[PDB]
Amino acid sequence: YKLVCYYTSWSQYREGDGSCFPDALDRFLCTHIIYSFANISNDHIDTWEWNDVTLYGMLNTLKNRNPNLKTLLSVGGWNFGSQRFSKIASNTQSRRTFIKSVPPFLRTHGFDGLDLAWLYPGRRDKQHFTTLIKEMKAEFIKEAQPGKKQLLLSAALSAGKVTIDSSYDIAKISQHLDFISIMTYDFHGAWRGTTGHHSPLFRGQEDASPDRFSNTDYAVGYMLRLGAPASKLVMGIPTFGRSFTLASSETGVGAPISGPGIPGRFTKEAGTLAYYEICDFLRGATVHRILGQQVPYATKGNQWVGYDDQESVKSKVQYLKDRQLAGAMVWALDLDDFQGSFCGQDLRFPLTNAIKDALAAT
Ligand SMILES: CC(=O)N[C@@H]1[C@@H](O)[C@H](O[C@@H]2O[C@H](CO)[C@@H](O[C@@H]3O[C@H](CO)[C@@H](O[C@H]4O[C@H](CO)[C@@H](O)[C@H](O)[C@H]4NC(C)=O)[C@H](O)[C@H]3NC(C)=O)[C@H](O)[C@H]2NC(C)=O)[C@@H](CO)O[C@H]1O
Numbered sequence: 001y002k003l004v005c006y007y008t009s010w011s012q013y014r015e016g017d018g019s020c021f022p023d024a025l026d027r028f029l030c031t032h033i034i035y036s037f038a039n040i041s042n043d044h045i046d047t048w049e050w051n052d053v054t055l056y057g058m059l060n061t062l063k064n065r066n067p068n069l070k071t072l073l074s075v076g077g078w079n080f081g082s083q084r085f086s087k088i089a090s091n092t093q094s095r096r097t098f099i100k101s102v103p104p105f106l107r108t109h110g111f112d113g114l115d116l117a118w119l120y121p122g123r124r125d126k127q128h129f130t131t132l133i134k135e136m137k138a139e140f141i142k143e144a145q146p147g148k149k150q151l152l153l154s155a156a157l158s159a160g161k162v163t164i165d166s167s168y169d170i171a172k173i174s175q176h177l178d179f180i181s182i183m184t185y186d187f188h189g190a191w192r193g194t195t196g197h198h199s200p201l202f203r204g205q206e207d208a209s210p211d212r213f214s215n216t217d218y219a220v221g222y223m224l225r226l227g228a229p230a231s232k233l234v235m236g237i238p239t240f241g242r243s244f245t246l247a248s249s250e251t252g253v254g255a256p257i258s259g260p261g262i263p264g265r266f267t268k269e270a271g272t273l274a275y276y277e278i279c280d281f282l283r284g285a286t287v288h289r290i291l292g293q294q295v296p297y298a299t300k301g302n303q304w305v306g307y308d309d310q311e312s313v314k315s316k317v318q319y320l321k322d323r324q325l326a327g328a329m330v331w332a333l334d335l336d337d338f339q340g341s342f343c344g345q346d347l348r349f350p351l352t353n354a355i356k357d358a359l360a361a362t
């Protein structure tokens with residue numbers, strides 16, 4: 001199975017033990033590591049961070065002792081702006097310039113492929129997205145025609161039904177992509193005004209779901225039936241949780257909230273907590289297993305956070321294997337306990353290793 005893991009270039013700036021650099025990654029942990037994110041300037045793919053060239057090398061160095069490890073560079077990301085991506089993909093000239101600039105850039109920096117993270121095409125860009133993927137793959141095939149190891153092309157896609165229906169032509173793009181990472185998390189925003197797990201495996205209590213489509217199982221099934229081959233589908237599993245600030249004594253699923261949770265010490269983003277930060281949070285907290293959804297939430301004081309742990313990722317892997325999917329995708333390596341000192345056990349990347357062991361099990 002494929003174990004696609006993301007590394008974010010901004011995790012380096014986190015205070016203390018939160019700072020994560022590529023060299024802190026286990027070269028034998030994943031089968032694919034994706035660097036996030038590359039920018040696009042003057043219609044050319046380009047670096048984002050001032051020291052990306054250095055970090056690129058730091059990441060690719062991992063391949064020296066592990067020749068089977070593949071690496072990809074992701075372009076886009078939530079903070080990229082679908083608007084900019086649209087202008088480039090819709091304009092015939094800009095699209096060509098961009099596509100042509102990718103192979104040289106990837107070979108120059110030691111990458112094995114490109115990951116498209118356009119979040120997200122609009123109803124207006126559905127076809128453009130298809131064309132972009134189709135032509136990019138063409139260029140990759142051409143660039144390797146002489147006899148090179150062809151560059152890989154993947155895409156991180158939304159797991160939301162509304163976005164999927166308006167942005168993607170699953171059947172068409174599935175043919176050109178080497179693999180699709182479905183982002184099966186972020187299913188329950190603080191805006192919804194109630195507590196909810198952002199990455200449940202199944203819908204669960206039919207009574208307590210704000211919507212039947214907001215769960216991992218529905219997204220996987222839906223995409224499969226839309227025409228994405230199981231052998232090309234990689235299921236996303238989060239190593240971070242979504243938090244809320246409770247508004248009353250109620251602490252169950254669907255309880256009243258006043259907004260996102262208090263920012264984590266290292267990630268410093270209201271509504272988000274890295275797994276290592278959750279392990280701290282767990283001290284003195286109560287953990288509940290959501291029956292039906294197969295995932296846990298933890299609550300303490302006026303805080304509540306839905307996340308994934310060793311037990312739940314194991315179940316999710318069991319699920320993807322039963323569905324004969326290509327494997328799992330992890331977002332992100334730097335949100336797992338990479339130091340291995342927060343969740344005790346001294347084990348590094350506890351959630352990602354749990355996923356790896358589960359994929360090899362049976
Ligand atoms: C079911 C449904 O459609 N719900 C909608 C939500 O999907 C949507 O929320 C966005 O969901 C995206 C995935 O579909 C998120 O993008 C990926 O996932 C991570 C984590 O959420 C993103 O965030 C990371 O990267 C940004 C920079 O780009 C960084 O600033 C953040 O700190 C970082 N977050 C964490 C915790 O690591 C990535 O950009 C991206 N990764 C990949 C694989 O490409 C997106 O972040 C998320 N938006 C937000 C801000 O929550 C919401 C949006 O309103 O709408 C629902 O309807």
Ligand SMILES: *[C@@H]1O[C@H](CO)[C@@H](O[C@@H]2O[C@H](CO)[C@@H](O)[C@H](O)[C@H]2NC(C)=O)[C@H](O)[C@H]1NC(C)=O
Nearest residue numbers: 038039040041042043044046047048049050084
């Ligand atoms: C990614 O590339 C874009 C170029 O397309 C950069 O955006 C430009 O930023 C400068 C300075 O902030 C502005 O003067 C330009 O108007 C922007 N170009 C436009 C119109 O898109 C962007 O800064 C790059 N990202 C990073 C952080 O390096």
